[PDB]
Scaffold this active site. Structure first.
Site, PDB file in Angstrom:
ATOM      1  CG  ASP D  72      -2.061   1.005   1.071  1.00 28.95           C
ATOM      2  OD1 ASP D  72      -2.740   1.003   0.023  1.00 28.95           O
ATOM      3  OD2 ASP D  72      -2.268   1.798   2.014  1.00 28.95           O
ATOM      4  CB  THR D 105      -2.780   6.153  -0.817  1.00 29.97           C
ATOM      5  OG1 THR D 105      -2.022   4.938  -0.855  1.00 29.97           O
ATOM      6  CG2 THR D 105      -3.910   6.005   0.189  1.00 29.97           C
ATOM      7  CB  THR D 106      -0.820   3.775  -5.400  1.00 37.01           C
ATOM      8  OG1 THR D 106      -2.087   3.163  -5.669  1.00 37.01           O
ATOM      9  CG2 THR D 106      -0.119   3.000  -4.304  1.00 37.01           C
ATOM     10  CG  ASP D 403      -6.135  -0.955   1.576  1.00 30.42           C
ATOM     11  OD1 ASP D 403      -5.855   0.262   1.560  1.00 30.42           O
ATOM     12  OD2 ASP D 403      -6.673  -1.541   0.616  1.00 30.42           O
TER      13      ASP D 403
HETATM   14  N1  ADP Z   1      -8.182  -7.545 -10.645  1.00 30.37           N
HETATM   15  C1  ADP Z   1      -7.740  -6.342 -11.085  1.00 30.37           C
HETATM   16  N2  ADP Z   1      -7.467  -6.135 -12.390  1.00 30.37           N
HETATM   17  C2  ADP Z   1      -7.028  -4.945 -12.836  1.00 30.37           C
HETATM   18  N3  ADP Z   1      -6.825  -3.876 -12.046  1.00 30.37           N
HETATM   19  C3  ADP Z   1      -7.061  -3.942 -10.716  1.00 30.37           C
HETATM   20  C4  ADP Z   1      -7.542  -5.210 -10.150  1.00 30.37           C
HETATM   21  N4  ADP Z   1      -7.689  -5.011  -8.829  1.00 30.37           N
HETATM   22  C5  ADP Z   1      -7.335  -3.727  -8.570  1.00 30.37           C
HETATM   23  N5  ADP Z   1      -6.955  -3.091  -9.692  1.00 30.37           N
HETATM   24  C6  ADP Z   1      -6.510  -1.677  -9.775  1.00 30.37           C
HETATM   25  O1  ADP Z   1      -5.237  -1.516  -9.146  1.00 30.37           O
HETATM   26  C7  ADP Z   1      -5.192  -0.263  -8.465  1.00 30.37           C
HETATM   27  C8  ADP Z   1      -4.330  -0.359  -7.213  1.00 30.37           C
HETATM   28  O2  ADP Z   1      -5.071  -0.973  -6.160  1.00 30.37           O
HETATM   29  P1  ADP Z   1      -4.350  -1.416  -4.789  1.00 30.37           P
HETATM   30  O3  ADP Z   1      -2.874  -1.567  -5.068  1.00 30.37           O
HETATM   31  O4  ADP Z   1      -5.125  -2.583  -4.228  1.00 30.37           O
HETATM   32  O5  ADP Z   1      -4.564  -0.183  -3.772  1.00 30.37           O
HETATM   33  P2  ADP Z   1      -4.279   1.348  -4.171  1.00 30.37           P
HETATM   34  O6  ADP Z   1      -5.429   1.701  -5.081  1.00 30.37           O
HETATM   35  O7  ADP Z   1      -4.282   2.072  -2.846  1.00 30.37           O
HETATM   36  O8  ADP Z   1      -2.934   1.299  -4.852  1.00 30.37           O
HETATM   37  C9  ADP Z   1      -6.630   0.114  -8.151  1.00 30.37           C
HETATM   38  O9  ADP Z   1      -6.855   1.494  -8.451  1.00 30.37           O
HETATM   39  C10 ADP Z   1      -7.485  -0.767  -9.041  1.00 30.37           C
HETATM   40  O10 ADP Z   1      -8.208   0.036  -9.978  1.00 30.37           O
END
Ligand code: ADP
Ligand code: ADP
Ligand code: ADP
Lengths: 74, 468, 525, 540, 72
Positions: D72, D105-106, D403
């Site tokens: 995160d 937050t990323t 989270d």
């Molecule tokens: N199964 C998936 N396939 C494609 N993109 C995804 C999937 N799950 C999450 N994401 C995307 O990855 C991004 C990063 O999510 P995550 O790393 O869990 O937390 P954060 O959004 O705080 O970085 C999210 O904005 C989401 O849109």
């Protein structure tokens, strides 16, 4: 104090100090002027587009700087 | 000094191998009492064989089991060759003691010391039907100057601390009294402030303290004691000027700074129980007295010799003399080694002539067994025998003699039958040393062999060394 | 982008960032460095290691278990710190396989380096490794066998497992006798899972064969002076009192006197109070008394006059195990002599072994504590022997809790490797390549296990692979001649739970470490 | 604009302008803005790799030598050695997004990075920041309008949590814990619904602590609806298991309290000493009878007790513990419904909390046990217990559950949600392109700059995994032109379909709009700041 | 140089040599199956090895006749 002798060199030093103190606030005149963020010790950097507000938080040490800041404050 | 136990325990190199060799020497001293030099020399020989065994690209694990087979074979050979004795054979004990004293500076002071040692052993432990020997029974008085002839076999108690009661000497029929309460003004367990607002009160303070200390002296004399011993107290003054004066006015000997560890020994020997409370001043403190003389060694040391008690314990004391501290330590450790030899005679009564003869026999037998073996094991046993051959080389050395000739002559004499052939130091030659009474028990050489084999095996399976 | 080739370095003094491949290179190189530092203790021919202290302490220890190296070693690589953390977790779980899980993790990381150099993404490697771990776990549980119901088979498997644990240690000379001794010791607890109850001693000198088991208790606290030295068939009481210069706990109390007469009166009052406390202690009907803190001259003199022995310097562990083995109850208020249970013992003696005075307990009542005598020339071999014995007790307790066991010594390793290879050739994609690298690390573990003996590897590995392909799932490598054969008949067996825990821990550690891409550093101090 | 100003006066005299100007690098103006934007460049490019399920995990070694492997981004960059104030401003940006939503937050950091990416070329073209900021704000309004247009909401309430379970599993897919996503989603939703307020109020996270111990296996992670107590019983023979226990809150030591002010007591005679001894003994007697009067099962002592009190408690067979931390006392009192007890004066059986079940937990050969409390009929505190192979996977599980619970809290706050995974990003890019095509020309450069900035999320998602970014970009854009859908995006998990909705991915719309607004505001602020002072003396 | 055991090789070799004498009872370097060099045609001139032994002996002796170094 470099060449802060009696006469003209000390006046030149005062003028240079005035130029330096002007440079800090030289770019914030008007309603669409840029803002200043400068470290002020413990990191409580303040956003203030008003030039006078910049003046209250400066680090004036040259006598010319102080005798211009006092006029600005008045 | 000569004997290697103290030498190893004194010097230090900080390398782990050196420290564990020192520990091996200490363990050998603990188990038997001598042979520490022999066991460390054996370990060094096994290691000089081991390095050559190792440059030949040999795994350092099969050599460990080969060394184990060599160890068990050597133990079998040594047990077979050794001859048992009897607990009533004073001649064998005298021979063993004399042989033990030979490796010390008092080698020629043996005819008078070996009977001394065996008699001391007989006094301080069970004369027969026993398994262990208490070495704590006998204490040693190490004194500068004098000679071995000046050594004594006292059976009382000696106080090395100075006589704080100056002017009192040779209390005839002295009754030894040990106390633990400090001879000073009374003090509560809790903090007290002596506030004085009047002259009379301050006068009463010291008047009452004098009255109380006089009452203490009177209750001390109630039983009729004439010698007083005080503990070693540093928080409070064990002996005060007023108490010393009051006890000197009416003739009680006073000695302070007595260690608390000797109290248990005193109780075991005579039984004068320490006293911590004045009200428990019973009549069990004292007993019959025989002699109490403040002997002086030509002004080279002040001692309090008090010997002779009625029904004492099984404890004696030895006063060891000598010009310098080194020879005093040598004589003391020679006596200690003799006592340890008698202890080794107590259990596992199996005696064998020493002087390189057991090592020559072991080297020859292990060479034969290596010849009977095959594989890397035979070569490892050959290296084992070559290593263990070192002891007759060292004994043949320290005199300029040929080690090769001595070893081969001893091997040939063993081959023709004379297994007990050793090195005759007095004659400067090679012959049987049974006539020379060079005999050692089983559980000294056996212990050294086992310990050296275990240590070389321990350091054998070592890959790297790391620090934290 | 990377801060390695950047116009500015946004860092303090000593803080730096390196390129992704360089960052993983450093991290995994530290991990593999600690791995092969802990390496070379696998198999019965594991070479020992000295645990030296670089400081002025210079504490030298020797051990064959790598976990001891892990707990005491400086940390440089963060991945090395992760490895020591997971290995300590595994060690607290079970007493064996710690070095196994550490070396497996180190390999997994080094072939991870090789495979990333082979142009494979870390996520693909993680997915393939997860698939392979699932396959390996299912294969391991397929061949797992439990024999706890059969008491004779349970005892034989305990023999085999204790011998397996002791083979890697130097105690293989007496392995069988020490095995039966330790099994009797663990069964002496009547199913109790604790291990701190079993206590050990150290005595310098003597042969290793002189080591044995004492059914009672071994004690090494000195006896007082005035009290009689030996009284048997007594009642033992455990106390938590200071028993030294007992004073009022009130802080504000103070003494204000005008003369020494009141000082002597207060001293006599304190002595009388101490005498009353001593009489209160003696009211309990006790002869052998046990205390924690110091005992001064007046109470010991009173005890000697009373003919009652007082034992001091009995630490918390000692009184704990004494209460466990005799049923004694710890007390702090002595105003109720009959309200606290007293310890029951059959025979008490002060034996003389070596050159020290040791108190020996015999005929313990409860018996819920084992005391083991170990003899050694040096302290180093003594601590190695005690560590090996403790590891044996731990693995025996783990087997007692669950008797599901598998055939080790590379046998179950070949089961896992065969299953993973079968799945890898069954599956396409780079995941198959990653999990085949997993399988080859699995195969190379017993490879170095046997090569620590200076033996051959490829021939035995191929022979065992072929035999298990034929269905000889019970075939395992024999260390006796460096050959193959039925693993069970060798009497060397490994618990299935320990194997599963090691496999899972290695998998998780490799997964968490591999996900690291770049190394960022703060300001060092 | 380096090493001061070189004038040396103008008649040959030595000249002084600023203190320490021999090596002072004076930074004002456009070059200062270049410096700030490139420092933000470095920060963003070093941080952005933690985006998406395939996104890797950074590690950090702090000033104390403690590692931290994290996925995160907020906590990844929360402990950075920030030097320039712009990095600190981005840190407060991340903190604001984190405590505002928790996830994404990323997104703000990468979005700001790309915004500045094209802003620096726009500045190189010679464009003053004011019009860039105005165009960026117009673009942000356009993007927010698109986000509102493409919204879709479902049910979130406590009775139905299957969409909540899917959302939690999707959120935790980016974390390494994705092995048992279903199990962690179920246990997390059970924990959050164990105690919660559904009337748009906060859920007491003071009473919900994510704590666990190393060991075991990951799937052993289970929910403990109660309180975890680290301490253990002092006596060996003391019983370890008590059921239907009553908590006796104790805030005083089992010793006679001492006066606060300095005091002196004069004990002079034997009678005084004996009187003090018997007074102290009767004080212990009164205290122990007062303790036994309540008849409570478990007594929790903050200041502990001495040996005599321990023996008295042993004889009374009343379980008790010593030296327990104050926050733990507050937690156990709230969970058991206990009342504050200052000392024995207000000690009674009517002010005792109730613990349903109390047990000692063992984890093999460790000699270090713990106390677990659960089964409380009125348990107001619930905790989740996590098992792992090492302490750092434990920490990663802690932050992953954190989270996930934050995402659940956001869902509970409002059901207004959207579909992530670049599909909404691509739709926003389409909207910004449309606005650029339909708005005055001079600011269209800022328009398309903002568009390319929003385009970085699929950029980073693709290059994290490894697929070709731009061909997928064009194909998905063409399909989105064919059909308007916020569910046409990158198939990061290689499921073979670009239908993002079919893959059960849900994120809160409030999170995304707040992300865009915050990123635009921070970028606009950084565009208008060109002053940093440095001494630059190059000390040795 | 290859890896076979030294000592069991020695044992087998001199066992075969005491069973029967042949100047070709040595080492099977390339796993030809037998330790018979005649079958494997391992041939070398007698003069070469004669002079080998002789030169080695004489120079070893004359090196043994040196025991002094005085490096400045
Ligand atoms: N199964 C998936 N396939 C494609 N993109 C995804 C999937 N799950 C999450 N994401 C995307 O990855 C991004 C990063 O999510 P995550 O790393 O869990 O937390 P954060 O959004 O705080 O970085 C999210 O904005 C989401 O849109
Ligand atoms: N008169 C003697 N002639 C030959 N050898 C002797 C004679 N007296 C003693 N020795 C040898 O000297 C050795 C001394 O051994 P030991 O007392 O263990 O040495 P240390 O006291 O240095 O440990 C004995 O093993 C014994 O064989
Ligand atoms: N007789 C044997 N044959 C083959 N392998 C063995 C044998 N005995 C033990 N092993 C293996 O050697 C390994 C070394 O064990 P040990 O060094 O005690 O701890 P660790 O298992 O952590 O390395 C064990 O894991 C065991 O699987």
């Amino acid at each position: 104090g470099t060449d802060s002798s009696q006469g003209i060199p000390q006046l030149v030093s005062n003028i240079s100090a005035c130029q330096v103190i002007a440079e800090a606030v030289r770019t914030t005149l008007g309603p669409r002027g840029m803002d200043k963020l400068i470290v002020d010790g413990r990191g409580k950097a303040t956003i203030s587009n008003d030039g006078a507000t910049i003046l209250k938080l400066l680090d004036v040490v040259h006598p010319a700087a102080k005798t211009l800041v006092d006029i600005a404050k008045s | 000094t000569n004997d290697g136990a103290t030498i190893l325990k004194q010097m230090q190199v900080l390398h782990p191998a050196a420290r564990m060799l020192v520990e091996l020497s200490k363990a050998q001293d603990i188990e038997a009492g001598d042979g520490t030099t022999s066991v460390v020399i054996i370990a060094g020989s096994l290691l000089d064989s081991c390095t050559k065994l190792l440059q030949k690209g040999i795994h350092p694990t099969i050599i460990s089991e080969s060394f184990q087979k060599a160890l068990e074979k050597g133990i079998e050979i040594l047990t077979d060759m050794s001859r048992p004795v009897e607990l009533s054979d004073r001649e064998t004990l005298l021979n063993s003691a004399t042989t033990s004293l030979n490796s010390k500076v008092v080698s020629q002071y043996s005819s008078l010391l070996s009977p001394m040692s065996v008699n001391a052993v007989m006094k301080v432990i069970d004369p027969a039907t026993a398994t262990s020997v208490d070495l704590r029974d006998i204490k040693i008085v190490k004194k500068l100057g004098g000679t071995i002839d000046d050594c004594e076999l006292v059976e009382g108690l000696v106080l090395t601390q100075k006589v704080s009661n100056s002017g009192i000497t040779r209390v005839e029929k002295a009754k030894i009294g040990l106390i633990q309460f400090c001879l000073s003004a009374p003090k509560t367990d809790m903090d007290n402030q002596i506030v004085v607002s009047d002259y009379a009160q301050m006068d009463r303070v010291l008047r009452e303290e004098r009255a109380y200390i006089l009452n203490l002296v009177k209750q001390i004399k109630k039983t009729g004691c004439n010698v007083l011993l005080i503990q070693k107290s540093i928080l409070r003054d064990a002996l005060s000027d007023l108490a010393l004066h009051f006890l000197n006015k009416m003739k009680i000997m006073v000695i302070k700074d007595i260690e608390r560890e000797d109290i248990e020994f005193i109780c075991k020997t005579i039984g004068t129980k320490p006293v911590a409370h004045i009200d428990q001043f019973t009549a069990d403190m004292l007993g019959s007295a025989e002699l109490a003389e403040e002997v002086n060694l030509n002004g080279s040391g002040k001692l309090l010799k008090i010997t002779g008690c009625a029904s004492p314990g099984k404890t004696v004391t030895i006063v060891v003399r000598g010009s310098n501290k080194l020879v005093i330590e040598e004589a003391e450790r020679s006596i200690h080694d003799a006592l340890c030899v008698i202890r080794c005679l107590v259990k596992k009564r199996a005696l064998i002539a020493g002087g390189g003869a057991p090592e020559i026999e072991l080297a020859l037998r292990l060479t034969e067994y290596s010849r009977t073996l095959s594989g890397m094991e035979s070569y490892c046993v050959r290296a084992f025998a070559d290593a263990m051959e070192v002891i007759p080389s060292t004994l043949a050395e320290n005199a300029g003699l040929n080690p090769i000739s001595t070893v081969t002559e001893l091997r040939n004499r063993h081959a023709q039958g004379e297994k007990t052939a050793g090195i005759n130091v007095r004659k400067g030659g090679i012959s049987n040393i049974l006539e020379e009474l060079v005999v050692q028990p089983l559980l000294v050489s056996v212990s050294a062999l086992t310990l050296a084999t275990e240590t070389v095996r321990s350091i054998l399976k070592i890959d790297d060394v790391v620090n934290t | 982008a990377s801060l390695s080739l950047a116009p500015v370095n946004i860092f303090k003094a000593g803080a730096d960032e390196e390129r992704a491949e360089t960052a993983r290179l450093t991290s995994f190189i530290g991990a593999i460095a600690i791995g092969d530092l802990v390496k070379s203790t696998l198999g019965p021919k594991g070479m020992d290691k000295i645990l030296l202290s670089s400081g002025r302490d210079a504490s030298l220890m020797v051990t064959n278990d790598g976990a001891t190296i892990l707990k005491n070693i400086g940390v440089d690589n963060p991945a090395a710190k992760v490895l020591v953390d997971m290995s300590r977790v595994q060690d607290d779980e079970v007493g064996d396989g710690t070095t196994s899980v550490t070396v497996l993790a180190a390999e997994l990381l080094r072939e991870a380096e090789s495979l990333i150099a082979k142009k494979i993404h870390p996520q693909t490697i993680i997915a393939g490794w997860r698939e392979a771990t699932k396959a390996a776990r299912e294969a391991l549980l397929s061949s797992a066998v439990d024999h706890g119901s059969d008491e004779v088979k349970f005892r034989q498997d305990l023999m085999n497992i204790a011998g397996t644990t002791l083979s890697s240690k130097l105690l293989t000379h007496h392995k069988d006798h020490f095995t039966k001794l330790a099994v009797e010791a663990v069964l002496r607890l009547k199913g109790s899972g604790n291990l701190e109850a079993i206590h050990i001693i150290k005595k310098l000198g003597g042969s290793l064969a002189d080591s044995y088991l004492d059914e009672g208790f071994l004690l090494d606290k000195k006896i007082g002076v005035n009290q009689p030295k030996r009284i048997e068939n007594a009642k033992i009481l455990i106390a938590n009192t200071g028993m030294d210069t007992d004073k009022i706990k009130i802080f504000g109390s103070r003494v204000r006197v005008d003369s020494t007469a009141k000082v002597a009166e207060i001293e006599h009052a304190e002595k009388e109070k101490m005498k009353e406390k001593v009489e209160r202690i003696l009211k309990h009907g006790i002869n052998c008394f046990i205390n924690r803190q110091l005992i001064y001259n007046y109470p010991e003199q009173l005890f000697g006059a009373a003919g009652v022995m007082a034992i001091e310097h009995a630490d918390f562990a000692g009184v704990e195990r004494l209460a466990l083995v005799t049923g004694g109850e710890i007390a702090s208020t002595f105003d109720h002599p009959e309200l606290v249970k007293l310890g029951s013992c059959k025979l008490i003696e002060e034996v003389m072994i070596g050159e020290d005075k040791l108190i020996h307990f015999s005929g313990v009542a409860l018996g819920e504590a084992c005391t083991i005598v170990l003899r050694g020339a040096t302290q180093q071999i003594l601590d190695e022997a005690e560590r090996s014995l403790h590891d044996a007790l731990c693995v025996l307790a783990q087997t007692v809790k669950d008797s599901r066991t598998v055939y080790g010594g590379g046998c179950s390793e070949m089961l896992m490797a065969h299953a993973v290879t079968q799945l890898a050739n069954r599956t396409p994609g780079k995941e198959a390549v990653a999990m085949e690298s997993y399988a080859k690390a699995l195969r190379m573990l017993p490879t170095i296990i046997a090569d620590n003996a200076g033996y051959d590897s490829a021939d035995l590995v191929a022979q065992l692979r072929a035999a298990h392909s034929e269905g000889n799932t019970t075939a395992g490598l024999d260390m006796r001649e460096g050959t193959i054969g039925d693993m069970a008949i060798l009497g060397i067996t490994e618990s299935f739970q320990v194997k599963r825990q090691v496999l899972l821990s290695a998998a998780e550690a490799a997964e968490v470490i591999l996900r690291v891409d770049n190394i960022i550093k703060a300001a060092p101090r | 604009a380096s090493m001061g100003t070189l004038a040396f006066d103008e008649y040959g005299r030595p000249f002084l302008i600023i203190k320490d100007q021999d090596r002072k690098s004076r930074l004002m103006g456009l070059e200062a803005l270049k410096s700030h934007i490139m420092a933000a460049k470095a920060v963003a490019n070093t941080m952005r790799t933690s985006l998406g399920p395939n996104g890797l995990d950074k590690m950090m070694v702090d000033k104390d030598g403690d590692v931290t492997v994290t996925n995160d981004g907020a906590t990844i960059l929360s402990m950075m050695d920030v030097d320039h104030q712009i990095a600190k401003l981005m840190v407060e940006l991340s903190k604001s997004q984190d405590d505002e939503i928790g996830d994404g937050t990323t997104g703000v950091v990468v979005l700001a990075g790309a915004l500045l990416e094209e802003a620096e070329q726009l500045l190189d073209r010679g464009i003053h920041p004011i019009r860039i900021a105005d165009g960026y704000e117009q673009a942000a309004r356009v993007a927010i309008e698109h986000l509102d247009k493409i919204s879709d909401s479902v049910l979130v309430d406590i009775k139905d949590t299957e969409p909540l379970i899917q959302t939690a599993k999707t959120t935790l897919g980016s974390k390494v814990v994705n092995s048992c996503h279903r199990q962690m989603a179920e246990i997390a939703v059970n924990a959050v619904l164990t105690v919660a307020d559904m009337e748009r109020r906060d859920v007491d996270f003071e009473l919900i602590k994510v704590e666990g111990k190393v060991g075991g296996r990951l799937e052993d992670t289970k929910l403990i609806k109660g309180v975890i107590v680290d301490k253990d019983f002092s006596h060996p023979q003391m019983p370890k298991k008590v059921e239907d226990a009553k908590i006796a809150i104790l805030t005083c030591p089992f010793e006679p309290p001492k006066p606060k002010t300095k005091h002196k007591l004069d004990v002079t005679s034997v009678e005084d000493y004996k009187a003090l001894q018997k007074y102290e003994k009767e004080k212990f007697e009164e205290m122990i009878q007062q303790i036994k009067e309540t008849g409570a099962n478990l007594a929790i002592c903050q200041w502990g007790f001495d040996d005599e009190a321990n023996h008295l408690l042993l004889q009374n067979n009343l379980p008790a513990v010593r030296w327990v931390g104050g926050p733990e006392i507050e937690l156990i009192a709230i969970a058991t419904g206990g009342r504050i007890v200052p000392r024995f004066s207000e000690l009674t059986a009517e002010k005792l909390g109730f613990a349903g079940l109390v047990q000692e937990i063992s984890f093999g050969t460790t000699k270090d046990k713990m106390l677990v409390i659960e089964q409380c009929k009125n348990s107001r505190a619930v905790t989740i217990f996590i098992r792992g192979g090492n302490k750092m996977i434990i920490e990663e599980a802690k932050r992953s559950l954190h989270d996930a619970l934050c995402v659940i809290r956001n869902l509970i706050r409002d059901n207004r949600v959207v579909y992530g995974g670049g599909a909404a990003e691509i739709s926003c890019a389409l909207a910004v392109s449309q606005e650029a095509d339909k708005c005055p020309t001079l600011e269209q450069y800022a328009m398309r700059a903002f568009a390319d900035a929003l385009e970085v999320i699929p950029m980073a998602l693709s290059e994290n995994s490894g697929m070709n970014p731009i061909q997928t970009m064009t194909e998905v854009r063409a399909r989105q032109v064919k059909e308007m859908n916020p569910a046409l995006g990158i198939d990061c998990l290689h499921k073979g379909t670009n239908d993002m909705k079919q893959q059960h991915v849900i994120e809160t719309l409030i999170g995304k709009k707040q992300q865009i607004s915050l990123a635009t505001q921070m970028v606009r602020m950084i565009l208008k700041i060109d002053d940093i002072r440095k001494p630059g003396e190059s000390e040795e």
